[PDB]
Symmetry: C3
Subunit: 36 residues, 3 copies
């Protein structure tokens, strides 16, 4: 439905935001190794 589409998009946006933060966390660990 249209309402399910709206909720699906919101859930997709929240998943991306979580992935962006996970990537930032991995970057921090990788930079610690790269400059260790």
């Amino acid at each position: 439905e249209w309402e399910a589409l709206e909720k699906k998009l919101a859930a997709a946006e929240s998943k991306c935001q979580a992935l962006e933060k996970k990537l930032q966390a991995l970057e921090k660990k990788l930079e610690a190794l790269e400059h260790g």
Copy 2:
């Protein structure tokens, strides 16, 4: 169109799922280095 919007959202969701798995794979390699 509406139908193109539905397909675009499904394709976007599948791309995210693939990125989540790629990030998990990179995390595994980074953890091997971090604890090596």
Copy 3:
């Protein structure tokens, strides 16, 4: 609205594309360490 939904999906797709490229950049640094 419907038009806001279309724009929200486009913005979400562009965020994912940027994350895919960021992940590729982190992979390159991790591979340099993994084979160093």
